[model samples]
Target: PNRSISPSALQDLLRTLKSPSSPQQQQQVLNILKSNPQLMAAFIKQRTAKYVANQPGMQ
Candidate 1:
């Protein structure tokens, strides 16, 4: 659990994953998140909340 990425590195990773993506690249990102369950769970919960809150007419 000591493993960590800096904000800059995380931004780079996000950019790489989001740009010109491919199945293999996606799987690699999935693998990283899968390896870190706490990170994955927190991220998913946050994103889901934001998504739901932003839905059209959901406001």
Candidate 2:
């Protein structure tokens, strides 16, 4: 349970974090969040914000 992250959050974060423009950023994100459990929540929250902001709006 403590080894990995939740599917929804991880998927969204990975999609953004893995981008060519931010490949190096992933390692820093992983290192920071992996150490502090509380920070993981923040990371997910930030990623969710990005996902929601980038999604298409209702027609």
RMSD of each: 5.9, 10.5
Tens-digit per-residue lDDT, 1-59, candidate 1: 57674555455557556764566666665565665555567768778447544556753
Which portions of model 2 show Cα errors greater than 4 Å? 1-24, 48-59
Against the unseen true structure, what C-alpha lDDT does each candidate score?
0.61, 0.61
* Superposition error at 35 for model 2 (Å): 0.7
Error (Å) of candidate 2 at residue 55 is 15
Best by TM-score: 1
Candidate 2 accuracy as lDDT: 0.61
> TM-score of each candidate?
0.40, 0.34
